[PDB]
């Protein structure tokens, strides 16, 4: 696995904090892997097995790459580390896996998240087409936390101000639910907690029943469990949907 | 009483003449609960001493922590139609309010409502809360065919559109459009609000068909044409007096 050094910090917004990762390391990382998911590798104290953490690609340059990390509550290995972490220090990476982009062949795109979404909603929207229309519905932890997004004029973006995160799932789905209806064949992207993408998903499958060409959903934590708990949440729930 | 300061984060075009901003935030925390339909106050600073400018405004949808109001986009712009277009996402506002909702009354056998675009927010909230079984009429005055709207309604309540591109001094298009209709049989009530001379014929016109009591017959001026809100306070606390 690759050795990254840590050559820059960036306070985006008061609860998102990007990190550059570059040096000698970096030699040989694909090239334009912008949106691309990685693994950050966490050694374990009296284990050979590293702790595994999943964080977007935010941007990449020639010998770089940025990675925004969300300040949350209950701090795990992966924010504690983003927090702590040192110019010099290193980290070693897995990855980077395939990019999931929204599908471009559309009429119109819908692209909704929480703040750890809210690196690839960014990507996303670089590659839309300037003349696209839609949504970019993003739940955000404060109004601090609103970020001035490049975007298609066309493509309205929504802020969603929720300081912690619903069990229910109700914010994000509440406000799109409250949006007009798009017509036309679109795309829909979307990423957040557990049940918020529950939410989403019934809700947007029931509004515009799209292919699943046109329709990614993903689950990127679940309220109450580390990593390693979600990821069995997740599988099962996306068998259970597939089936 | 200390008002609200709420960030932008939404705005959409419902129609050509409709402008809906999303406002919420951290100065959202605490604010009553089911407050859809109820006024709010829009504060807009003035040069030194000068105490704020003061513009009414209806919720027209509430969620976890935020609420939408609609803006007419209408001639001769004042403070708040000039904010609402000219706002941008991360802006804030002073609000004060909720003040209390008036709905239509329920105890009923059929409903009418009427109004011009001032009113169709609380129009459309109150179709919400009607039963599914309702008998009646909703009569909306709009600027041009654009902004009629595809409100969610009852089946048997009518939608009824009026289509005017500027308002009658004399107040008579929404007044002729209802005088015009099948009178409805049984127990009703009322809800009407639009420009003041329309009020005035309305509320003529509808004491003399179903002559209802107080209780079920809701009459109110939202604006008054040449007359800034200021001015139209006067008239309409004078006019609520004579009565
Ligand atoms: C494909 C993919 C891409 C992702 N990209 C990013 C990214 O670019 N940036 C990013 O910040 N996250 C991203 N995530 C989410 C990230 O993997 C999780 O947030 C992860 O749980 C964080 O690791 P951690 O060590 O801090 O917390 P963990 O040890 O996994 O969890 C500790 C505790 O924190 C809670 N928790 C975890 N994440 C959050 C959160 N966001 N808000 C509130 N509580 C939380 C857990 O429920 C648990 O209680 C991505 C997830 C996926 C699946
Ligand atoms: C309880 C209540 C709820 C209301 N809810 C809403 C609401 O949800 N949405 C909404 O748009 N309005 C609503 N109104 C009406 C709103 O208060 C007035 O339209 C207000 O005058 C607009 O403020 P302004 O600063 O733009 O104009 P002002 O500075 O008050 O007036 C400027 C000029 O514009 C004219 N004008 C004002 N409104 C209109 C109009 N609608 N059409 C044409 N000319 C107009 C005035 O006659 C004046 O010449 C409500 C009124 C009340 C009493």
Not at 220 to 237: A, F, M, P, R, T
């Amino acid at each position: 696995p690759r050795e990254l050094t840590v050559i820059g910090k960036t306070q985006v917004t008061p609860h998102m904090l990007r990190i550059t990762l570059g040096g000698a390391g970096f030699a040989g990382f694909p090239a334009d892997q912008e949106s691309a998911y990685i693994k950050l590798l966490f050694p374990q104290q009296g284990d050979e097995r590293p702790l595994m953490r999943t964080y977007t690609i935010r941007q990449q340059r020639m010998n770089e790459i940025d990675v925004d990390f969300v300040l949350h509550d209950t701090d795990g290995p992966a924010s504690r580390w983003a927090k702590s972490t040192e110019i010099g220090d290193t980290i070693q990476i897995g990855g980077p896996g395939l990019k999931k982009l929204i599908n471009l062949n559309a009429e119109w795109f819908l692209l909704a998240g929480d703040m750890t979404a809210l690196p690839a909603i960014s990507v996303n929207l670089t590659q839309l087409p300037n003349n696209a229309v839609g949504y970019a519905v993003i739940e955000v932890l404060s109004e601090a936390d609103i970020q001035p997004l490049v975007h298609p004029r066309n493509v309205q973006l929504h802020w969603v101000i929720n300081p912690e995160a619903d069990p229910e799932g109700k914010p994000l789905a509440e406000r799109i639910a409250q949006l007009p209806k798009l017509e036309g064949q679109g795309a829909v992207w979307l990423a957040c907690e557990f049940s918020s993408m529950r939410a989403l998903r019934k809700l947007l499958k029931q509004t515009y029943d799209l292919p699943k060409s046109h329709f990614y959903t993903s689950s990127y934590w679940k309220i109450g469990c580390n990593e390693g708990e979600h990821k069995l949440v997740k599988q099962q729930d996306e068998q259970l949907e597939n089936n």
